[PDB]
Design brief:
part of a larger assembly; 2 chains; A: mainly alpha; 5 strands; B: rod-shaped; gene regulation; Transcription; chloroplast; RNA polymerase
């Protein structure tokens, strides 16, 4: 029990779903009933790879073997759903947590804000933060980062200033993720004065090494063959808290680069993430489907993903080219086609390949291009400002 | 006379919805 749970935790931490599945099969093949904690590690790994179907099967199997889910199990699902913006499934857990006798802790509130944010529900995201303070609790550093992303996403420059300065008002030294979100909201409004003001703060950074290297590489100082090894050195050091922290770091970084005009640099940063296992669902290239999955990405990251995907399309035929913007129960509804990600991807595709990618009549969160229309198709310019 | 001739799958496997 101790060895099985130890290995599965590592698989769930690093998002190695294939290894986690084999440990579960090995335990069953030896007539061993895995513990409730062991299944939670398997559920964690599937959520790291956006394999929601296999994650909910393991959750279903927990009750079958009598290993009822613990509080940590309902957190593995919430963080898995939060990254994809599946607030419909997040509310199912929340409506289940109140019935299961589990009070809402702080971690539950953070996932709720993150799920609503990624799902485009900006009004409901701040309401959770509004209702969180009424219930007392104690917002942590990620909660401040959770609500800062909401304001940064909906282009609130003055709200983002107040949120960001208060982070350092308590001598917290906000992480590199919050700095990259400041660059996005300043880069979205073309506020080039504030961008240079924040960059000089990240250039000195005598205390934190990651801010210095990442801040330097954004400006383009580290774009040399030998000078890209230092940037890679930081990425390998950050590639030790698992895929959970990595996806948050790359989403903010690509968002900052795209809004600052460093669109060619964002292409190489995304290429650095994929080889490290980040965004394993991003691309599929077989004879049937050529797909790009952007439901767990930021707006800047999605644009970078589409730009590379479109350029690679023109190089080469599959039966279909699809863009997965909504991946959940919201697909079977009209709300998915009104999602901010779905509209942004379609708007991005409209003025890059003319009217070649149209919606689907059978799914709200898909943007397809038939094989016949693929014949009638760089397509996107990737340059640094 | 009357003595003659000796007289759970499909559970916990539903749609999450």
């Amino acid at each position: 029990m101790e060895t099985y749970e130890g290995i599965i935790f590592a698989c769930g931490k690093g998002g190695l779903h294939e290894d986690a599945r084999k440990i579960l099969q090995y335990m069953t093949a030896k007539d061993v009933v895995p513990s409730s904690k062991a299944y939670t590690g398997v559920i964690e790994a599937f959520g790291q790879a956006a394999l929601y179907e296999e994650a909910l099967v393991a959750f279903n199997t927990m009750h079958e073997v009598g290993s009822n889910p613990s509080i940590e199990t309902f957190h593995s699902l919430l963080y898995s759903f939060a990254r994809g913006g599946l607030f419909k499934e997040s509310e199912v857990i929340l409506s289940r947590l109140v019935n299961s006798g589990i009070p809402r802790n702080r971690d539950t509130f953070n996932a709720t804000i993150e799920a609503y944010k990624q799902g485009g529900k900006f009004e409901e995201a701040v309401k959770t933060y509004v209702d969180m303070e009424k219930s007392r609790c104690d917002p942590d550093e990620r909660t401040l980062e959770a609500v800062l992303s909401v304001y940064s996403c909906a282009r609130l420059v003055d709200e983002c200033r107040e949120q960001f300065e208060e982070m350092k008002a308590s001598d917290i030294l906000p992480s590199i993720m919050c700095y990259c979100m400041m660059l996005s909201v300043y880069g979205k409004t073309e506020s080039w004065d504030d961008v240079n003001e924040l960059l000089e703060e990240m250039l000195s950074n005598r205390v934190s090494n990651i801010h210095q290297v990442i801040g330097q590489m954004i400006k383009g100082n580290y774009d040399d063959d030998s000078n890209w090894q230092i940037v890679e050195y930081v990425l390998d050091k950050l590639n030790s808290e698992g895929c959970g922290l990595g996806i948050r770091f790359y989403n903010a970084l690509l968002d900052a680069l795209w809004w600052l005009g460093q669109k060619e640099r964002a292409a190489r940063v995304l290429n650095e993430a994929t080889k490290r296992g980040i965004f394993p669902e991003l691309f599929r290239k077989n004879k049937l489907v050529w797909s790009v999955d952007v439901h767990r990405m930021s707006e800047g990251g999605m644009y970078t993903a589409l730009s590379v995907w479109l350029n690679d399309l023109s190089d080469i035929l599959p039966q279909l080219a699809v863009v997965v913007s909504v991946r959940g129960q919201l697909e079977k509804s009209s709300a998915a086609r009104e999602s901010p990600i779905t509209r942004a991807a379609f708007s991005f595709l409209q003025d890059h390949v003319s009217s070649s990618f149209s919606f689907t009549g059978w799914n709200g969160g898909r943007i397809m291009c038939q094989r016949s229309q693929l014949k009638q198709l760089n397509i996107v310019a990737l340059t640094n400002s | 006379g009357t003595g003659f001739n000796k007289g759970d799958i499909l559970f916990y496997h539903r749609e999450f919805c």
